[PDB]
Design a protein around this nucleic acid. Structure first.
Lengths: 487, 326, 59, 56, 34, 86, 64, 231
RNA sequence: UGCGAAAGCAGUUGAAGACAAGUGGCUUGUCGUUCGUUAAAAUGGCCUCGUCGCGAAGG
């Protein structure tokens, strides 16, 4: 003996925009929940050590959401002006928020009733603050006093390091993720700088010039960093000290970046960017930073962030727009005692239990039970789909006989064949099967066409559909001709 | 614990004759030691065998049973050839032959001589100061039918013509279980439950050496010249003393330790090995009754030895007509 | 059904054996019983996951 | 120094007649039902049923 | 065939290559136990 | 459709047949019961036989012959025999 | 492979033997092996048979 | 000594049996395994222990053929539709009896069966037979080696249990008898060395809810013979 | 049937015999019949294995 061959479903052949696995994995992000906020959602950060929380930065009101239920769980509203930068320490325990009054405050997580300490920065709005990645207790704050500073939170009274050397509107910081003594900054004249923290820290050891005023500087490796300003993002490498990639597939200036490594995906590394245009686009740092997928939202997206590498639950993409709301696109990952014994100590184990197959279709068991006319009739029920109907038509063509499947019909049951065939003749992959099926039905039912008046209008508008389709295919043949000219 | 009641190797290590129980009978059997299975049962549970010994001219076994008989039983033919008897219904506790002269002790302290060429009784006698008996051995000095060695809880070298005790050795605190003569003058002895073998001179009564093992013993087997004695211990290991009559001055520790561990991590026991010159016949129960063997090279293996054997423990039954994915 | 729920009846005189199946016997919730063909062994398997084996002295 | 050497077997080569026999099968089992004796055009195979090898 | 020879085939379809007292007691026991 | 042949004394089933495919509605025999003709609602009238001498030694019925004859149904049947008509 | 018990005229079916059948009969001591001589007709070139017998237990094949 | 001491079990011991000549006590339960001990007085050990995943075994028993005495099958059946046949001659193979031929709507389960010999009454081809509990009133018999249907007898009410008598006719020739109960108390005894038709039917004097029947004193399932004339 | 390209190219088609039916002969049909040419129709359709506490012939 043998088994039974499963009735295949011949899907769509090589149409363009083919389904690549990276766009499959990003395509399965569903349920785009849209949450209103009060003002422009400037900054969004995530929780490092338990990637289950993310912090959003509205005007005067910093919220933190959880990834399990995607509702607001805590607020932070002891801010005397608009609040700008929200960041987490790497042990996930304390939230640093830089506001516009300059008194940059650090709370701890889930306890807004206790401000841990208030760093007095300059009179200028402290526009970005973030903790160090390697060390915990050093905190980088850049205000628009054309300067940035490193504070030790233990010795919170004084600036531990005073990083000057930037001209106009210092705006982003990132630390080189292997050597902790290398701190990279960005300003609004371009000229992405970086400094050694052991040095005096008053001039960059080497600067890198994005010609546009740089908008975000992140690190994806110890070797290469990614800086963006204007309508293109440029990858620089520190070892070659040189720009080596630039993609400009946007309209307006790209406004935020981030990176994710080693997470559960066919695409290993992924750098996604928000672009102030309505699009957030993912780029693949493996093969020369090509674009891979892009989500469109209903206004200029001002920041975006994805869930980190080890999220362990519902993985998130989030993007705060400047219009006043926020987009979350998520993906989600005593008598019967012996009857679980499962054979531990026993000598010889025998196993031939057949797995239950998935449930066969109605037309599949009809063709397998050889009732061919019933297979055709249960095939042309409007509860079925296009590829299923095409495959049962292909099956009856290839194996049985369409003459046999039509040998006992009448005026009535010959209608839904032609009624499907009207929609089926127009598209590409069906029209040959439509052609020979309506050809053999008009071969076999000519005298009933003479008697019965009902399907005559079906034959008439099938003639019109054939004329419409021969006109369309003739002009497409003309386009094939003129491409043969242009080659 | 063993379901083999008791077993005995033939001389020159070829056939193991072993008696086990099988539904209140006594499945005796002979197995070659390189498939021999059609071997007999006796009648009911009140006729179990008590001792057994080979005889190597045909080849046969003698079974000293408990009802009062000795059964001379062939091996090539399956039937019992002859049934030696006493006049008493008392339990024969040990038998030993020497050429034609057979000698069986009783449980009622008697001694009987026999001969397996004339098939009749010769002498039927008891002696004083031997109040229990459970071992005896005719001594090797050629056809020295005289000067045999009886043994129970103390060892008595007794004559057959002076017919009285000529020397008395100290035994154990237990009834003796193994007494075997290894030279023309030395004999090893050892009770059950204790780990102590002691060898005795037959002419002085001085305990020359004491052998020790990591457990109490079940059966010993010596070489042809008393230079290697292998005992099987009750925890299922094999302890071989090499060259046990040299001079670590009075009490020799065990030299070679062979135990058999299957390739799933399960220790299987070893009973009744046999060591002639430069080989070892290790026997062990694979299934519940059918035994397997191994001819291990004796002098070249290291001091300890975990012999590996394959055994079914979680093997998926791949059939000769199916595939792996069914 | 119940604990210690086995009996033996002497079949020719159809009497019931008095002395053996007493409460000092650990029959348990008996769910199988089987005789040997010639040894007079008697296996009783109970619900707790063991089988005890008596021997009848007469056979 | 080349040579041709027959190595492998062919069709089973039954009693391929034109309906001259209704017993068109000349294979056999041994009386100990463990061995299948089967003729070929080129060989005479003997198989063992519990192992399904060419046992000779 | 890539073992450096050739294989042909017939139509009487065969394939071919273009090529370049213990012992006596044990015997009696094995005889009598069957 | 289960045409079942029950024994009269001892009152149980001698043999059975799931021959028919729907409701059996009538049946008959002949004067010495070598034949039982059944006919149902799927119009397949078929004839069980007991004609051979070994089959009447066993008194066991075979599912001998089948015949379709009709368009829609059977709702009744009858049989007759003579020495000039059957 | 269709085997018909005659006391009800009812069948047990083996559906696909990758070939049409030419000869088949029982060959056991009491009928515990089914011989089969199948032919595999989908090539009209050669007369390429295929011998198989199969035990009647679960109708699994043995030594095609 | 406890017969399940050398190897522990895990469910209720749903069936015990013995080999009819060899010293083997076969044990099977709801922990989807079946062991076979070699048993004696002081100890008892495991010999093999097959373990069938997926399928429990409500009842499992030895079978030796009467003619050749060299078959040694194990017939193990659970609450599913299949029974398993093991052959013993010392890994090991089994077969999955799962094909009622003509009568598939009469076996809800193989939950209870028996095994019995049969001489075929025109030639002395003694072969084994398994016998299954039906669902309406049926009891099917089968063939032990091949697995053909042979016949299915039927009583009314519910089949509750049944047992196998034997009776000799001449030297080396015997006719078997299947005795089967109702759930009320009138039983049918029909021989099946010819085709299975009832030769006697009688009512239990009293008895309403009856649950088991066992015949014997001579030979039966718990003690068959090995010579045919020892029936 | 032969070639060849997946399209097309060139060409077959008889002789005898047997048997049956229908009207002693005569018309019509089938070939487990021979030679020669490279030359639809019996109510009959493909299996199961998804299934449901202790206690050695008393205390």
């Amino acid at each position: 003996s043998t088994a039974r061959p499963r009735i295949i479903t011949s899907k769509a052949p090589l149409l363009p925009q083919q389904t690549t696995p990276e766009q499959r994995y990003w395509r399965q992000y569903t349920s785009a929940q849209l949450v209103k906020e009060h003002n422009s959602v400037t900054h969004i950060s995530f929780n490092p050590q338990h990637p289950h929380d993310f912090a959003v930065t509205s005007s005067t009101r910093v919220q933190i959401f959880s990834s399990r239920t995607r509702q607001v769980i805590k607020t932070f509203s002891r801010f005397k002006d608009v609040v700008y930068s929200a960041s987490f320490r790497s042990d996930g325990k304390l939230l640093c928020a830089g506001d516009a009054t300059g008194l940059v405050s650090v709370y701890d997580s889930y306890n807004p009733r206790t401000i841990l300490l208030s760093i007095n920065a300059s009179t200028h709005p402290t526009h970005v603050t973030k903790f160090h990645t390697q060390d915990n207790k050093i905190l980088a704050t850049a205000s628009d006093d054309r300067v940035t500073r490193l504070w030790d939170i233990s010795n919170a009274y004084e600036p531990q390091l005073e990083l000057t050397g930037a001209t106009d509107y210092v705006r982003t910081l990132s630390f080189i993720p292997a050597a902790p003594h290398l701190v990279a900054t960005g300003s609004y004249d371009g000229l992405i700088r970086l400094y050694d923290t052991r040095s005096s820290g008053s001039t960059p050891i080497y600067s890198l010039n994005h010609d546009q005023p740089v908008e975000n500087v992140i690190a994806v490796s110890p070797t290469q960093i990614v800086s963006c300003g204007g309508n293109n993002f440029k990858v620089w490498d520190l070892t070659s000290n040189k720009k080596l990639y630039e993609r400009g597939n946007f309209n307006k200036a790209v406004t935020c970046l981030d990176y994710v490594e080693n997470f559960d995906s066919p695409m290993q590394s992924a750098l996604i960017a928000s672009s102030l245009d309505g699009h957030v686009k993912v780029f693949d740092p493996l093969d020369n930073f090509q674009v891979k997928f892009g989500w469109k939202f209903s206004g200029p997206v001002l920041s975006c962030a994805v869930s980190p590498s080890t999220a362990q639950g519902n993985r998130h993409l989030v993007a705060g727009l400047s219009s006043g709301l926020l987009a979350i696109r998520t993906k989600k990952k005593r008598m019967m005692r012996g009857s679980e014994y499962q054979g531990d100590q026993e000598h010889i184990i025998h196993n031939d239990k057949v797995r239950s197959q998935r449930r066969m279709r109605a037309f599949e068991r009809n063709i397998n039970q050889f009732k061919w006319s019933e297979a055709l009739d249960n095939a042309f029920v409007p509860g079925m789909a296009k590829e299923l109907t095409l495959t049962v038509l292909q099956e009856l063509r290839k194996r049985g006989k369409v003459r046999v499947a039509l040998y006992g019909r009448d005026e009535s049951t010959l209608e839904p064949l032609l009624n499907w065939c009207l929609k089926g003749i127009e598209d590409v992959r069906s029209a040959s099967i439509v052609a020979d099926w309506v050809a053999v039905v008009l071969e076999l039912y000519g005298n009933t066409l003479e008697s019965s008046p009902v399907l005559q209008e079906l034959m008439i508008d099938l003639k019109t559909k054939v004329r419409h389709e021969i006109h369309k295919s003739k002009e497409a043949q003309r386009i094939e001709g003129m491409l043969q000219l242009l080659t | 614990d063993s379901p083999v009641l008791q077993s005995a190797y033939d001389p020159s290590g070829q056939y193991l004759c072993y008696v086990t129980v099988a539904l209140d009978k006594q499945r005796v059997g002979v197995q070659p030691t390189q498939w021999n299975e059609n071997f007999l049962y006796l009648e009911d549970s009140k006729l179990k065998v008590t001792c057994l010994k080979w005889v190597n001219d045909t080849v046969a076994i003698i079974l000293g049973m408990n009802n009062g008989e000795i059964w001379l039983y062939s091996v090539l033919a399956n039937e019992v050839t002859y049934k030696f008897t006493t006049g008493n219904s008392y339990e024969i506790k040990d038998i030993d032959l020497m050429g034609n002269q057979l000698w069986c002790i009783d449980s009622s302290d008697a001694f009987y001589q026999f001969d397996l060429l004339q098939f009749k009784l010769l002498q039927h006698f008891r002696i004083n100061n031997c109040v229990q008996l459970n071992k005896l051995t005719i001594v090797p000095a050629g056809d020295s039918v005289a000067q045999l060695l009886v043994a129970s809880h103390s060892i008595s070298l007794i004559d057959i013509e002076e017919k009285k005790v000529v020397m008395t050795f100290p035994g154990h605190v237990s009834p003796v279980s193994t007494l075997q003569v290894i030279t023309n003058e030395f004999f090893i002895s050892g009770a059950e439950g204790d780990r102590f073998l002691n060898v005795y001179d037959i002419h002085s009564g001085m305990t020359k050496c004491v052998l020790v093992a990591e457990s109490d013993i079940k059966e010993l087997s010596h070489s042809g010249q008393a230079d290697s004695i292998a005992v099987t211990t009750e925890d299922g290991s094999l302890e071989i003393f090499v060259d046990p009559l040299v001079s670590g001055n009075k009490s020799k520790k065990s030299s070679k330790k062979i135990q058999i561990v299957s390739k799933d991590g399960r220790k299987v026991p070893i009973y009744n090995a046999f060591i002639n010159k430069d080989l070892l016949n290790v026997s062990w129960l694979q299934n519940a009754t059918m035994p397997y063997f191994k001819n291990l090279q004796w002098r070249e293996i290291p001091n300890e030895y975990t012999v590996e054997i394959s055994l079914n423990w979680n093997n998926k039954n791949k059939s000769a007509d199916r595939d792996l994915h069914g | 059904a119940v604990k210690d729920a086995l009996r033996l009846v002497h079949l020719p005189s159809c009497s019931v054996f008095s002395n053996w199946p007493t409460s000092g016997t650990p029959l348990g919730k008996v769910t199988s019983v089987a005789f040997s063909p010639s040894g007079g062994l008697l296996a009783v398997g109970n619900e707790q996951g063991k089988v005890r084996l008596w021997k009848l002295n007469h056979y | 120094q080349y040579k041709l050497s027959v190595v492998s077997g062919g069709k089973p080569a039954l009693n391929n007649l034109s309906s001259v026999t209704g017993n068109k099968n000349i294979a056999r089992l041994s009386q100990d039902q463990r061995n299948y004796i089967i003729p070929f055009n080129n060989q005479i195979k003997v198989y063992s049923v519990e192992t399904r090898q060419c046992v000779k | 065939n890539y073992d450096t020879d050739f294989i042909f085939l017939d139509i009487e379809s065969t394939l071919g290559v273009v090529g370049t007292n213990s012992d006596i007691f044990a015997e009696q026991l094995h005889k009598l136990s069957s | 459709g289960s045409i079942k042949f029950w024994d009269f004394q001892f009152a149980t089933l001698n043999q059975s047949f799931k021959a028919h495919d729907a409701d059996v509605l009538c049946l008959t025999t002949d004067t010495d019961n070598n034949y039982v003709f059944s006919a149902g609602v799927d119009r397949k009238i078929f004839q069980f036989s007991q004609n051979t001498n070994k089959s009447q030694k066993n008194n066991r019925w075979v599912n001998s012959s089948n015949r379709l004859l009709h368009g829609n149904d059977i709702r009744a049947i009858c049989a007759y025999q003579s020495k000039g008509a059957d | 492979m269709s085997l018909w018990q005659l006391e009800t005229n009812s069948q047990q079916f083996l559906p696909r033997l990758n070939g049409i059948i030419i000869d088949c009969q029982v060959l056991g001591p009491q009928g515990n092996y089914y011989s089969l001589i199948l032919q595999m007709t989908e090539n009209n070139s050669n007369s390429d048979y295929q011998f198989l017998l199969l035990n009647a237990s679960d109708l699994t094949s043995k030594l095609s | 000594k406890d017969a399940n001491a050398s190897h522990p079990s895990h469910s209720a011991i749903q069936s015990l049996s013995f080999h009819p000549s060899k010293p083997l006590l076969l044990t099977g339960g709801y922990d989807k395994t079946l062991r076979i001990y070699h048993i004696d007085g002081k100890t008892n050990h495991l010999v093999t222990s097959l373990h069938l995943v997926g399928s429990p075994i409500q009842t499992c028993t030895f079978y030796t053929s009467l003619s050749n005495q060299n078959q040694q099958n194990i017939f193990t059946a659970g609450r599913r539709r299949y029974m398993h046949s093991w052959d013993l001659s010392l890994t090991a193979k089994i077969e999955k009896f799962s094909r009622l031929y003509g009568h598939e709507s009469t076996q809800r389960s193989f939950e209870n069966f028996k095994v019995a010999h049969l001489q075929n009454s025109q030639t002395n081809s003694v072969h084994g037979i398994v016998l299954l509990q039906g669902n309406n009133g049926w009891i099917n018999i089968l063939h032990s080696t091949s697995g053909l249907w042979l016949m299915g007898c039927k009583i009314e009410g519910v089949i509750t249990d049944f047992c196998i008598d034997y009776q000799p006719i001449s030297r080396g020739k015997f006719r078997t008898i299947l005795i089967a109960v109702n759930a009320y108390g009138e039983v049918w005894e029909f021989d099946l060395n010819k085709n299975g038709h009832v030769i006697r039917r009688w009512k239990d004097q009293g008895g309403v809810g009856i649950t088991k029947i066992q015949v014997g004193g001579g030979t039966t399932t718990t003690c068959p013979a090995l010579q045919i004339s020892k029936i």
